[PDB]
Symmetry: C3
Subunit: 413 residues, 3 copies
């Protein structure tokens, strides 16, 4: 009636047993009360669904097909289930707690069609685009990872077929803020996103964290703490224009930190990025006219012994930043590269920092590499030409055909 | 009594009919209970006014003249009324919804003295400065644009004399966060602002979005999604010092993206800016000692046919970034310029990217322009001198008097 | 029972008299109900404690030793007690208000062991790290500063032995957001912080604002408004790796704006920084491999007469940015330096902007200084060598041994 709901004060269902059913029942009530689209200049204002702190099992997928639905909690509730599951089991009764908390949605769905494994599915076809759905300040917990045939401990596979929030349909002005996501194969997957804001979340110990799929425009991913798994994405986007990725602190152990396919006229600037593997920032498949500026890159070795010898399958010639596209701008970045000579792959290679594999007119200027071994600060493959490379390394450190690229060596000594 | 109010649980008035009267009545109650300024080290702590999701007509301006008032909702509620009003009317009954939603304040005021058309007016004279008023997570909707004599469709004029929030008086530590503003001639106009934060709002389809007027200090405009109209401002400030404009995604179709008059010692950095017209970033009237860094600029052509041939009246010689002032710093920006040779104005002109019209000592370094036609990457008018221009174009691309400016051409080939 | 508490609806104690006792009593209730760590895949989800707007005296320290506790209010409640206490006392009855407001915690504790003076202490030993505690949108007010033997007015000393929030123990995924802190000797002191976010706070008129002590990793300090006192820190961190400090607007009058000791592989970029003293950004004691990029620095003279002739004890040879460490990256910064020749200390010195006191391999490029007098844009002490200094000043403006540093002078005339 006033469009405000509390999942613990809804007469149908029990949010401890199946919060999915409770929230779907609330959505049915909202639709039943908000049937008319144009009464007194309104009629479908949406609603807010509140999750007090608590442990809520979700056994039924929530389907969101209305605009202006806010689902909110009172705690992102993150704790490192990765650490706990790797603590010897005999010690567990002495730990102060074992599980995540906050306003906690435990995803008890089977694997899927990865969409069928999503705790929250936002889907609606026809017009207009579903708009201004808000997810705020709650926890989504996939609980366990499971055996995947790799022979790794089940809890270290980053595999369970669960998604936190999956948006399947064209959307406008969505927000995901202050969330906690933990132990999900995919935290947050949003297709066809316009003017989306993913802001100030904690998205960690998920196989993949943020994936923007299909296409999108004018969106932003800001002020997030992000940590993925070795076969997955930390931040991924495809066929986006005008995307802004800034003020994120991305820590291990994603396959990459930022991965673009067909992303144009976007900006990946002023992020702190830390990886245990090469291929931290990948601009692929005609990723063009992007600004990659004033980021702090750190690549070093996994120190945590349960994941020692786990990697993303990419060798040190890959580059920390790899670009396949035209007319990008790579300006003012810092690269710390820490590798041991005896584990450089392939054997005896000179690791590369910035690699230009294809495209023309890439402008690379004023980048500082600090490395414990010799590196190729910039490697321009013969398939990329007419690039401009300034103050990003000495002549030895910039491997490039001087006949078809403009190179200025950083002054030395 | 506990200083928490809900507009749907206030005995006087009806928030569906006139939420303005309801909120003014609440403000009167707060003042009546909080009369003494110094009882037990306190006495005027303010209050919070909650707007549940719903459609609320405002027929009376809300006057806020107390410090520490928070007005909060549960949904920014944006949908594109611009798209809807341009969809053929016969199809409207098949649309899933027609209007914005969330915690929605429908501004049913007549035009004004633009202040008289504001849904919320913050005004108080005397001392100290009104402080720490907070606007959070609600929607302000001006409902319709109206005929303005231009012969454009009424809904495409961006003209109705309505303002969302107008702050007339000197203020300190104000916040506007998580808001939605739609279909207002002016979304948000704040005069005399100290240490203001305008953060993570969605401010779109308004004639002008953010205007900081009169003067101010130490303020910031961060993480906003902003889109204005062709005669208005996206982000505007005058006589501000120490302003930080960062992490915004500004999309069309403002006259400009960022417009400064007499703004000094401020920073416009790490924004994504997209316009359909020249004059995207304007530093005017002694705008000096500002940093304009690592922004992504895109200028291209309006693709949406209802606005085809609508422009901001400025030609391609204007520049994407135009500077009239001293000692600014323009560093690490990316400029994508997309124009068709046959529509360049004036006929046969070479479009300019960065223009220095007046002032001395401007430092312009390491800027990358990508353009489908030849451009003047930097044009230094004779009225601007003693500038330093580095790695922002070849010699041909930097039009400047070498006798009185320090120029280093980007190395070529 | 639903884990949601309101301090004005708790039967034990009176939050006006001692909110500390009320909140401790709530914490005891949470622990009593949440005793089991593993019941139905949960058991200790934590809770949320709500503070409506009001004036609450705290006479007992709150001890937080549970994970996933959120303490939230409805107003940051800042007003300038500094201005008020310096307004002649006869005029106070004509001021509209005298005190801060919002959801206000008045810290009525004696001085301490500074931890004993903290309104909120977060402490817990053993495993795992206390996690995902959230502080949101309330005000913490230390009420008065006191005589410190300096002979300054008591209210201008920035000394009272009070701390707002003190985190003593190893912590993960903490958040401090939307807070107001005022008139505390230390606003916010967090030891041993992993993946912490201090975001969008107003932390002003405190002796020191933000201190990250002991060690930490992967944390961020973003979008804050910060102003400290002349013997204290605005933003301080020690032994942190992977720290991101961005989008902050730091205004006077801290001893410094950003101070690092033993901080590595971190980023201080895209902040607006204003000081009345030298030594604005200090990288000390092996602060290495940090990016300091696209910041706007302003150093000028204190204009406010109650603090005229108060300073941080550092002379103009200190530098605005001082670096003692290896392999840092200083890129794209703007420095406005405003000093009067007659007050330069020591007499007749040429003030320095960037100083390299020790370490090797620092990369300093494309920095713009604007100064009303001649300055040493970069001073490389003999104890720092093998640095690279590009486009940060003419030859005269870069004081450095050319035999052991790579220098390119900014082109002139």
């Amino acid at each position: 009636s006033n469009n405000r709901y509390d999942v613990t004060e809804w007469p149908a269902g029990n949010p401890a047993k199946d919060i999915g059913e409770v929230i779907n029942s609330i959505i049915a009530d909202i639709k039943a009360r908000q049937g008319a689209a144009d009464v007194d200049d309104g009629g479908k204002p949406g609603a807010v669904i509140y999750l007090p702190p608590g442990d809520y099992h979700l056994r039924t997928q929530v389907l969101i097909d209305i605009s202006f639905l806010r689902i909110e909690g009172s705690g992102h509730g993150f704790t490192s289930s990765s650490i706990r599951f790797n603590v010897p089991e005999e010690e567990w009764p002495d730990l102060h707690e074992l599980w995540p908390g906050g306003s906690r949605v435990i995803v008890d769905l089977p694997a899927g069609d990865s969409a069928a494994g999503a705790a929250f599915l936002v889907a609606r076809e026809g017009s207009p685009r579903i708009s201004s759905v808000e997810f705020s300040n709650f926890c989504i917990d996939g609980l366990h990872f499971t055996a995947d045939g790799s022979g790794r401990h089940p809890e270290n596979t980053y595999a369970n077929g669960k998604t936190g929030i999956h948006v399947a349909s064209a959307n406008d002005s969505f927000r995901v803020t202050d969330m906690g996501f933990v132990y999900l194969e995919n935290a947050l997957t949003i297709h066809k996103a316009d003017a989306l804001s993913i802001h100030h979340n904690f998205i960690a110990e998920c196989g993949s964290c943020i994936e923007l799929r299909g296409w999108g425009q004018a969106s932003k991913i800001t002020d997030n703490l992000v940590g993925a798994g070795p076969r997955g994405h930390s931040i991924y986007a495809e066929n986006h224009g005008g995307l802004l990725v800034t003020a994120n602190n991305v820590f291990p152990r994603g396959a990459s930190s930022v991965h673009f396919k067909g992303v144009t006229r976007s900006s990946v600037t002023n992020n702190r990025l830390h990886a245990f593997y090469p291929g931290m920032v990948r601009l692929e498949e005609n990723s063009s006219e992007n600004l990659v500026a004033t980021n702090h890159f750190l690549r070093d070795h996994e120190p945590w012994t349960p994941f020692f010898g786990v990697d993303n399958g990419l060798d040190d010639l890959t580059g920390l930043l790899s670009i396949s596209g035209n007319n990008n701008s790579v300006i003012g970045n810092h690269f710390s590269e820490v590798v041991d000579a005896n584990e450089i792959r392939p054997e005896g290679a000179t690791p590369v920092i910035i690699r230009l594999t294809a495209g023309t007119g890439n402008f690379v200027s004023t980048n500082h590499v600090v490395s414990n071994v010799d590196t190729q600060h910039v490697l321009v493959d013969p398939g990329s030409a007419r690039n401009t490379i300034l103050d990003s390394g000495s002549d030895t450190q910039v491997v490039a055909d001087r006949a078809v690229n403009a190179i200025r060596a950083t002054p030395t000594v």
